[PDB]
Each structure stands twice: as structure tokens, then as C-alpha cells.
Design a protein around this ligand. Sequence first.
Ligand SMILES: Nc1ncnc2c1ncn2[C@@H]1O[C@H](CSCC[C@H](N)C(=O)O)[C@@H](O)[C@H]1O
Ligand SMILES: Nc1ncnc2c1ncn2[C@@H]1O[C@H](CSCC[C@H](N)C(=O)O)[C@@H](O)[C@H]1O
Ligand SMILES: O=C1c2cccc(O)c2C(=O)c2c(O)cc(O)cc21
Ligand SMILES: O=C1c2cccc(O)c2C(=O)c2c(O)cc(O)cc21
Ligand code: NA
Lengths: 319, 319
Amino acid sequence: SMLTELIASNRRSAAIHAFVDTGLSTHFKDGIYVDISELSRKSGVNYARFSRLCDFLVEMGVLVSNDNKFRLSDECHVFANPESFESFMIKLEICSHYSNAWLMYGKSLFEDDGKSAFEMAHGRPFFEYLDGNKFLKSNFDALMTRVSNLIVEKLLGIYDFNQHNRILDVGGGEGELLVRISEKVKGKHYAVLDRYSELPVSDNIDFINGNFLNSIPSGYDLYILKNVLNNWSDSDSILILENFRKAMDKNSSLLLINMVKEPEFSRSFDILMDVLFLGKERSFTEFEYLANQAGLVVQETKVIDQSYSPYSFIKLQIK
Amino acid sequence: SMLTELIASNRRSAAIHAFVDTGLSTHFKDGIYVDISELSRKSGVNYARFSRLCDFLVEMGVLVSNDNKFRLSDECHVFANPESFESFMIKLEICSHYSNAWLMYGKSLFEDDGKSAFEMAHGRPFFEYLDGNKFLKSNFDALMTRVSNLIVEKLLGIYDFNQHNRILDVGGGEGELLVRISEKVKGKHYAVLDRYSELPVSDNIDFINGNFLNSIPSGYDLYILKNVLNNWSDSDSILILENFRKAMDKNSSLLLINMVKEPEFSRSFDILMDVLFLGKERSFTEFEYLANQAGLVVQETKVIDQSYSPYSFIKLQIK
Ligand SMILES: Nc1ncnc2c1ncn2[C@@H]1O[C@H](CSCC[C@H](N)C(=O)O)[C@@H](O)[C@H]1O
Ligand SMILES: Nc1ncnc2c1ncn2[C@@H]1O[C@H](CSCC[C@H](N)C(=O)O)[C@@H](O)[C@H]1O
Ligand SMILES: O=C1c2cccc(O)c2C(=O)c2c(O)cc(O)cc21
Ligand SMILES: O=C1c2cccc(O)c2C(=O)c2c(O)cc(O)cc21
Ligand code: NA
């Protein structure tokens, strides 16, 4: 039934995971039709059992079937690329750590100790745990790098970066955003702040080991905070924006860039942020409220359109 | 996007699991509208975070929102009952053992050792593992009991059981099917064969500790095999049906009752049977082939409509 297939929603994720995580999807490059008999002889995958998985992937719209051959749908071409954002997403989505986090989600709703379902499962908050787990950190940092690489073109389009001199990306991870911005917008100073046990190295990039809960360094006229506040509570979000106000002078600008909560789109991500971080996906007005509480003023707001979600672009300056 | 929410299908199952497994859903009996403010004060669940879960359950069509209150949808009334088949289904669906089995699914497609993804994860085949695991066994045996209870009325309706004298249910589990049949069809000999470390006890039911891979006891004129063959390969399925033909005389009947593979319905269950058992959901034609290889003939074929899935009713006799 529709109700039992809704209960069995996990089977869709798990089917895609088996298809992608094995690298079987990498045989479906450039919308080529694949003979499963040939793929079975080549890769050693069981013909009959993989044929049944392919049938389920057709039902899901991941594959298209014609004359007993299978190609990836136009929309799912990304699964042929193991470096794609979608490839890293599914590898994390149903990994043992996320699964065990979800199994503590119910119990976490009855606790007021400020411990996420992830922390209740694993004994540390998400980012602290990633320090001791390379599988989670490498895949998570790689996903953030891919979505950073996707948005850069449209971000340069809507805001003049040439007016600025000194640019700091706060929680910039591997620093892919500013590496890409520096290629187009040259002659500037570029710095990336994150939690680094070993500093990354890149041409024209000053990598800083820091903690945006404690302080943000002053002496930059442009600050960037992309996909950070979704990982934090309202009070921790205010504390971060307060550290920005303390760091910023009258001619400083902060670009607050996040996936925005539209009524039209799914709440599934909002729940994942609760499970992993005790975070949430916020609306424009919710972001504006946090900024005003921290002593920051909205100078301009824009919407950036990305394939997977709309983004909220919010320019902030001090009162 | 539609692709990223398809990747994130597991989030639907996990959200439902949190709502049902905690017993929060049992506050929504008889389609009543629930004040979440009051439920939070009563149960101690966090208001703001559970409100966000409820908004996701509305999006899924599990809850309906009116007058700043929430009720279960007509179809999802079953979630209010912790005794319901649907409640046992979601408890198993994303449990750690199923999750770890799914994470071995991809790797299992490249092996030819006859080890299910479940066995690769846990070190024993499903039913042998359940012998040592009270959570898995109790919940699985409970699920099978509920679906056995649901079908019995329609099963008695489409087949005359009064013509028979000695009835054996092979792999009959807790024995729910024959217990309910014996209440309506009186003055018969009733036997249930399964794997029992301790024999169940029930008025006028002969419980047998057996192995249908080894032998089926002779001297019964009616045999029942319901939701068994989906747990077995083609060769193991033939072996079971061969053991039936050796046990059956010319006057004997075997009722082969299974959820049937119809092109209209989802292939998700077929894949789950691969992961847990190296089994499969089969069509009428596929069942007929196996029966013919075992030396049995299809005399009667009917379809039984159940809420969650259509059932194939196949009456077999020896050649
Ligand atoms: N206390 C802290 N100080 C600095 N960075 C932190 C931090 N806690 C978490 N982070 C970083 O915050 C980032 C959240 S993910 C966002 C990465 C990047 N801005 C992008 O949009 O792609 C991670 O890189 C994480 O390491
Ligand atoms: N080798 C074996 N011999 C006998 N029963 C077996 C078996 N292997 C598995 N079983 C049993 O087969 C059943 C499969 S589930 C089916 C239960 C019941 N017929 C129903 O439809 O509700 C379980 O009860 C399991 O314990
Ligand atoms: O896919 C994302 C993602 C995509 C775009 C923007 C994002 O911020 C995220 C994000 O934060 C995230 C996450 O925190 C944990 C995940 O398992 C997956 C994702
Ligand atoms: O829900 C079912 C189910 C329903 C009806 C008839 C069934 O046979 C089953 C079944 O076999 C099964 C299973 O083997 C493992 C599960 O996690 C769930 C189910
Ligand atoms: Na009203």
C-alpha cells in the first residue's frame, strides 16, 4: 500500500546506496545504455540479483529501461560521477553513524540536556566526533566542498566582491568557496577560518585555526558565514553573530548564506539538523531576528536558486 | 529537489519510527485532535522540537493540522495501536540489524557463497540469528501473527476447509492462522510445524519442532505454506516443494499463499527479501515453474485482496 511503502521509504535510500557506494553507477556515464549480462561478466556482480535492483531503480526513476538495457535518467546523471555532491550525500545519509543517531531521535525529544540524538548515540557532539572519525569528516568536508563549488558562479553574479579588500570565510571548511572567488576576483587578501589540527595550504589563502564560538578576528571588511547557523541553536547562533559584531567596524559587511525554509519545500532537512546538531533550517525573518538580537542590521536580502534548494543571501552590518 | 528528497527517503521512515517507537502516536487514538502544548506538559516531550516533527508528519500525510491541533489521518489510525502490524513493521524496518544488513547489500551482490547481506553483517542466516535475539524474534513473530490474523476471514471465504480432516500449517510460526481457522472450522486435527526451542501450547493444536528443508510429515490431506517461499532461493524453494510431494498422497492438497509480484505494485519488498534471506517476491508463473520442477500441479489459482498487498492463493496436488 501507499502507507506501507511510506513506512518502507528507507528501502529507496538503501537501494541507491548499494548502486552508488559499490561504484556500479560509474558504468552509466554519459547516458549510455548498459547490458547487465555484460556488466555481470565484467564486474562479477550477480546478474539476476542486480537485474532485480535495476528494476527497483527504474520504479524510483533513477534508471530508464529500453530493450532489456538500463541508462541513468537525465536528472540522475550525477550518480555516474563519484566526485558529485549527490554521491557523498547518499554515502553519509544511511551510514551506521547517521542510522544510530536516528534511532536516538525519539528518545532525544524527552531530554532537555542539550545533547543531540547524534551525541546520545556516539558520546560527542557531531564536529568533535568528526575529529576522531576520518570516514565522517572526509565525506562531510567533501560534500560541503561540492555544494560550495556549485553556488560560487551565482554568488559572484548577485554581489560585487571587487569593492572589498580583506575577505574572511568563517567556518569555510577546506576553503573551496574563497579558492574559487580568488580565481575570478584577484588582488585581494583571502583568509579561511575553521577547526584545523593541521592547516591546509593553498596559493593566496591564509588558513586560520579558530573557534567562532569564542571570537572572530577583526580587520576584515568582508565576512562570509555559509551553511554554519543550520548546525547551531538560536542562542549559539546569536553568540556567533555577537562575535561578528565585536569583530566588525562601521565599513565591515557580513554575508549570511544558508538554505532557506520555504513552505513549498520538504521539512526533512530541518529534522536532520535537529538529529545531528540540535540545529534547524530557518526562514528569512527567523535569520533577521537572530541578527537584530546580536546587534546587526539587514542592509539587503536576495534569494539564490540552486538545483536541490533555494538559498537565502543576507548582507549584515553593525547598528 | 525531487532527487535529493529521494536520496533522503530514509528520513520519512526515521521520522515515523520516532513518533511510533516512543509511543507518542498512542495519544492519537480514535482520530482525536491533540494539543501538542498539552501533550508536551503531560508526556514531557520538548514542545518546539516535537512541533517540528509534527509539521514533517503533516507533509507526509501521517497527521492532519486543524485548530492548532493534530490528528492521525484516516489511513494512519493504525499508528495509534501498538498491537497493529504497521507498528511492528516500522520497529523492524530501520532497527540497527536491518540497517547493518542494508550496508552489506552492495557487497553481497559480488559474492557467490550463498550468504545474505544479513548473514554477512551478523554472522548467521536470519532465522538462526533470531534464536539468540529476543528483540528481532518477538517483533518478527508478532508481525507474522498480525498479518495471519488479518487474512484468515477472506481465506475461509474463498476455500472450503470443512472437506478436510487433518490440516498441517508448515512454517506456521506462533500458529495464529490455524488457531483462528480452528475456532470457525471445528472437529478437525490441527498441527503447526516450525523451529521451536520450546513448543508453544494451544487447545487442540499439535505443535511440531521440524525442518521443512529435511522432511514434511505425511498423513495430512491439507498442507498450508504461507509467506515461507519468499524467504528462500529457487533451489531451496524446489527442495521444500519436493519434500511436500514426498509427504502428499493423491488426495492431499497444498495451499501455497504468498504476497504476489504484480507489475502495478512496488519492488521494494522483493529487494528486502534479497537483503534478509537471499529470497524474492514471485509471480503466479514463477511459483508454477517451481511447483512443476518439484512434481506438483496447479489445480486452483485465486487472488486475495489485503490492505497492504494482493495475495496469490495457489492450490497444488501431486502429478
Ligand atoms: N567552533 C567552530 N569554529 C570554527 N569552525 C567551526 C566550528 N564548529 C564547526 N565549524 C565548521 O563549520 C563548518 C560547517 S559546514 C559549512 C562549510 C562551508 N562554510 C560550506 O558552506 O561549504 C565545518 O567546516 C566545521 O568544521
Ligand atoms: N527450516 C525451517 N523449518 C521450519 N520452519 C522454518 C524454517 N526456517 C524458517 N522457518 C519458519 O518459517 C516462518 C517464516 S514467516 C511465516 C510465518 C507464518 N507462516 C505466517 O504467514 O504468518 C517463520 O515462522 C520461521 O521460523
Ligand atoms: O547534503 C547536505 C547539505 C547540502 C547542502 C547544504 C548543506 O548545508 C548540507 C548539509 O549541511 C548537510 C549536512 O549537514 C549533513 C548531511 O548529511 C547532508 C548535508
Ligand atoms: O511486513 C512484512 C510482511 C508483511 C506481510 C507479509 C510478509 O511475509 C511480510 C514479511 O515477510 C516481512 C519480512 O519478512 C520482514 C519485514 O521487515 C517485514 C515483513
Ligand atoms: Na479553528
